[PDB]
Amino acid sequence: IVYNISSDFQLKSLLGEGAYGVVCSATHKPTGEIVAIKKIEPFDKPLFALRTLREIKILKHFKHENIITIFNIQRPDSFENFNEVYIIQELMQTDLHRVISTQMLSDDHIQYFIYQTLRAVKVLHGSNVIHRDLKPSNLLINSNCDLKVCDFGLARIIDVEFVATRWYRAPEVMLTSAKYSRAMDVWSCGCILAELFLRRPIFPGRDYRHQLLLIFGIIGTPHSDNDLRCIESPRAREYIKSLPMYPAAPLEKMFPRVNPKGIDLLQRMLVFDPAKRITAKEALEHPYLQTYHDPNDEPEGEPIPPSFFEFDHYKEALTTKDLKKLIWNEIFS
Amino acid sequence: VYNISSDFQLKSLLGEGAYGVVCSATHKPTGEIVAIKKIEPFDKPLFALRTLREIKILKHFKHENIITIFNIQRPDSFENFNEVYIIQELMQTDLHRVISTQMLSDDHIQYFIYQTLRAVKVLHGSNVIHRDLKPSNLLINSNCDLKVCDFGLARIIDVEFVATRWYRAPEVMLTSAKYSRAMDVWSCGCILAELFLRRPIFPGRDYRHQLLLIFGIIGTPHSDNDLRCIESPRAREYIKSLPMYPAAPLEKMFPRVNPKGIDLLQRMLVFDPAKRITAKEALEHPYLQTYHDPNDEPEGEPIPPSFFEFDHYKEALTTKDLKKLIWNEIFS
Numbered sequence: 001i002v003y004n005i006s007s008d009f010q011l012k013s014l015l016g017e018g019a020y021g022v023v024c025s026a027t028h029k030p031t032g033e034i035v036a037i038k039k040i041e042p043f044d045k046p047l048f049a050l051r052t053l054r055e056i057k058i059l060k061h062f063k064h065e066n067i068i069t070i071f072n073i074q075r076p077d078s079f080e081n082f083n084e085v086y087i088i089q090e091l092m093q094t095d096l097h098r099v100i101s102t103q104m105l106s107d108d109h110i111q112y113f114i115y116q117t118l119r120a121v122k123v124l125h126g127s128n129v130i131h132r133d134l135k136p137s138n139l140l141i142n143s144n145c146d147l148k149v150c151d152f153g154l155a156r157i158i159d160v161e162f163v164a165t166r167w168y169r170a171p172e173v174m175l176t177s178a179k180y181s182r183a184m185d186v187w188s189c190g191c192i193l194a195e196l197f198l199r200r201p202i203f204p205g206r207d208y209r210h211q212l213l214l215i216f217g218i219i220g221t222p223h224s225d226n227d228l229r230c231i232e233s234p235r236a237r238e239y240i241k242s243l244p245m246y247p248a249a250p251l252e253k254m255f256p257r258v259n260p261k262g263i264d265l266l267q268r269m270l271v272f273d274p275a276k277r278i279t280a281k282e283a284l285e286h287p288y289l290q291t292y293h294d295p296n297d298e299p300e301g302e303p304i305p306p307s308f309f310e311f312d313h314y315k316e317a318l319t320t321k322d323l324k325k326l327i328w329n330e331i332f333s
Numbered sequence: 334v335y336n337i338s339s340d341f342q343l344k345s346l347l348g349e350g351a352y353g354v355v356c357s358a359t360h361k362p363t364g365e366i367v368a369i370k371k372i373e374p375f376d377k378p379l380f381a382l383r384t385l386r387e388i389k390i391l392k393h394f395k396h397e398n399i400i401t402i403f404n405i406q407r408p409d410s411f412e413n414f415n416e417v418y419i420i421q422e423l424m425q426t427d428l429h430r431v432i433s434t435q436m437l438s439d440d441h442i443q444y445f446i447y448q449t450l451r452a453v454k455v456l457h458g459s460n461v462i463h464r465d466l467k468p469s470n471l472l473i474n475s476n477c478d479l480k481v482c483d484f485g486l487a488r489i490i491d492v493e494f495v496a497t498r499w500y501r502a503p504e505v506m507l508t509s510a511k512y513s514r515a516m517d518v519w520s521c522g523c524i525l526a527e528l529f530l531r532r533p534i535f536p537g538r539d540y541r542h543q544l545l546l547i548f549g550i551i552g553t554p555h556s557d558n559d560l561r562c563i564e565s566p567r568a569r570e571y572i573k574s575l576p577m578y579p580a581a582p583l584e585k586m587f588p589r590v591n592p593k594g595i596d597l598l599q600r601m602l603v604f605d606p607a608k609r610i611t612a613k614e615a616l617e618h619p620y621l622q623t624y625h626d627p628n629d630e631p632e633g634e635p636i637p638p639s640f641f642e643f644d645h646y647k648e649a650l651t652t653k654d655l656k657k658l659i660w661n662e663i664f665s
Contacts, residue, residue, distance in 0.1 A: 019377065045351055045377060045379075045380075046379060046494035047377070047494075160646070160647065160648075160649065160650060161650070162378035162649060162650050162651070163649045163651055164651065164652055165651050165652070166649065169649070174648060174649075207651075207654070208648060208654075315492045315511070317493050318494055318495075319496065321497070321538075321539075322539070322540075
């Protein structure tokens with residue numbers, strides 16, 4: 001696993017080989033710090049190029065306790081042989097998926113993990129950034145319990161497409177065109193909070209249809225004009241009537257060993273109507289989290305213009321060179 | 334490794350990449366030599382979708398100028414479906430690399446240029462546009478047979494990523510008419526231009542620069558009839574905002590070139606896609622009467638948009654969705 005990176009960096013262990021590239025825990029000979037180094041050969045894979053670009057722009061902009069820190073990107077020399085991107089970021093022991101899969105967590109830890117995840121969402125939205133793909137495995141965690149969001153490969157700046165799974169995607173997002181709302185992120189959190197209690201995905205659909213069936217199977221099938229009063233889609237409203245009509249299930253009655261307040265906050269997130277869906281801010285304020293809530297320390301963010309990801313706004317086809325230059329430029333200032 | 338029927342004998346590796354290895358093999362039963370691609374696209378969304386298009390377009394056609402795929406391996410399980418073995422008709426090299434490494438007689442030029450427009454014609458007649466033609470998507474075999482492949486950006490007629498736009502038509506770049514049959518003729522004209530020049534005629538360094546180079550030879554459009562087919566205000570402003578140079582006389586740029594070829598070049602590399610000559614009209618035109626033959630030239634047959642149904646659903650696709658598309662296409 002070659003790494004043509006500075007001498008000062010002595011690799012240690014390979015933490016994961018992904019579709020993106022490999023990530024290794026290395027040491028900063030000088031200060032003796034332990035960092036995470038990503039090697040990414042993305043130039044023949046357009047999709048992975050943009051993803052990497054997005055991620056690099058976002059990580060670098062924020063300076064938040066719940067969003068991963070990039071320490072520095074290695075700069076190449078010739079744009080002519082630039083075929084690898086090396087990113088030195090903070091090393092993180094595990095992620096929220098792995099943790100749920102091996103430990104039972106006290107209501108406190110859950111309060112704290114969902115608290116941190118909401119804190120980050122607040123700053124992202126406050127900044128006009130929508131993650132668009134929150135799931136347990138994007139929430140990295142440190143040995144002392146720091147949760148940190150990463151993987152903004154699908155992020156967007158507000159005002160086909162591919163996903164690894166739609167297990168945490170919001171129904172309004174699958175049923176319509178409203179695929180760039182702050183609400184959709186708050187829906188993912190609902191799901192994440194659900195997994196924290198159930199220790200398993202709450203809506204593990206196996207395909208599109210089955211996903212909705214699973215969702216309504218719990219929150220309830222939207223029927224009247226007031227339920228679909230956020231689904232102006234004639235098609236979406238048709239398709240909904242092609243699914244059985246269930247009543248919302250009593251989450252409280254079925255999961256009685258779970259903190260009643262969590263259940264409330266959960267219900268206020270898992271709501272079909274994106275407009276009645278609790279917002280990250282109102283979420284931090286919710287009872288269930290009062291222990292950790294402190295409004296003088298829930299950063300509101302600084303707006304980021306759409307031009308941040310200008311590419312999302314032109315039709316012009318992007319070429320390979322184009323992508324390599326956007327990343328290149330990103331690296332040189 | 335090449336997990337495939339032992340009825341094959343692997344000769345040699347022909348190349349690699351992101352998609353995965355591809356190599357020659359003998360079909361013991363007929364002693365016919367073939368190429369077997371080993372794609373591992375399910376962790377690369379965009380590649381799986383490209384693969385899906387290639388498999389559907391190729392399996393469908395039966396033209397001498399479109400690559401022929403003989404079979405596709407049958408996976409015997411969805412759970413463990415991680416590769417795709419395509420067995421297609423071996424090809425020695427590609428026009429890019431031929432131009433790239435030799436002077437070709439005006440004869441050779443017409444041969445390849447005829448074959449190329451031959452294929453484009455059947456596809457255009459079948460409502461299929463390639464949308465990404467260039468020298469390296471033109472594969473050539475021994476007895477100089479030209480066959481087009483790489484339909485990863487094709488669409489059915491009733492944004493995206495590309496390696497380069499050196500072959501993209503100006504109107505596609507400016508406007509949103511990124512789906513005309515015309516864009517393929519423009520690409521064609523760039524192949525032709527390149528056959529004479531022996532190098533890319535419009536090697537732009539970037540969006541603007543590409544337009545600056547194209548207009549540098551064809552003339553910047555400025556008149557209403559020039560900008561007749563350009564419905565966008567924003568787009569018109571753009572053109573009107575670039576250096577405005579008058580067309581250059583091809584004859585004095587391709588001097589050691591067949592006067593009948595230039596005329597064809599000028600008929601293809603035209604800004605107005607409406608005026609632009611078509612794949613059929615190109616076969617007829619003088620420079621190509623030596624191979625023309627209003628018989629041996631299929632006009633194809635319209636394919637229904639549903640052939641590419643997925644280009645009509647705005648839902649997001651998942652890994653499983655993708656594995657399922659290719660899977661169905663292999664068994665159905």
